[PDB]
Amino acid sequence: LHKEPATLIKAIDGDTAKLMYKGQPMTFRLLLVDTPEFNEKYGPEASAFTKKMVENAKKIEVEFDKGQRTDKYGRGLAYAYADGKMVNEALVRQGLAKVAYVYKGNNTHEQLLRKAEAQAKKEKLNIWS
C-alpha cells in the first residue's frame, strides 16, 4: 500500500472526517474500526481523540487498501495518518474503537489492529473498562 496526500476540511466524529483528496472534498470512513456514535458512551471521547489528532497534524495522508475505495454511501475507505501515526490504530490502542467491518480484500492492517485491541483490553481502557 501507499500513502497519498490529503488536507483536513473538518473533523466529524471518531471514525469519519471530511478531507480534501486529489483536490475534492470527501467524507472518509476509517477502515477496520468502529467508534461509538457521539450519542453513545465513549462517543464524545472518540470524537475528541480523532479531532485532536487530525487538527494538530502538520501532514495528513490517506492509504487505500487493495479492494473497495468507497462505500455505498460514497465515503472513502482508508487508513488515515497524522504526522505518520495511523489514526485507525491509535483509536483501537486507546480503547476508543473496536476492530470491526473486516471485509476480505480490504484487511491489510487487520493483525496490527487486533494486536492494539488486545493491549487496550489488557489495560481495561475506556470501552474495555
Ligand SMILES: Cc1cn([C@H]2C[C@H](OP(=O)(O)O)[C@@H](COP(=O)(O)O)O2)c(=O)[nH]c1=O
Ligand atoms: C468501515 C466500513 C463500513 N461500511 C458500511 C457498513 C455499514 O453499513 P450499514 O450502514 O447498512 O450498517 C456502515 C457502517 O458505518 P458506520 O459505523 O459509520 O455507521 O458502513 C462498509 O461497507 N465498508 C467499510 O469498510
Ligand SMILES: [Ca+2]
Ligand atoms: Ca461508528
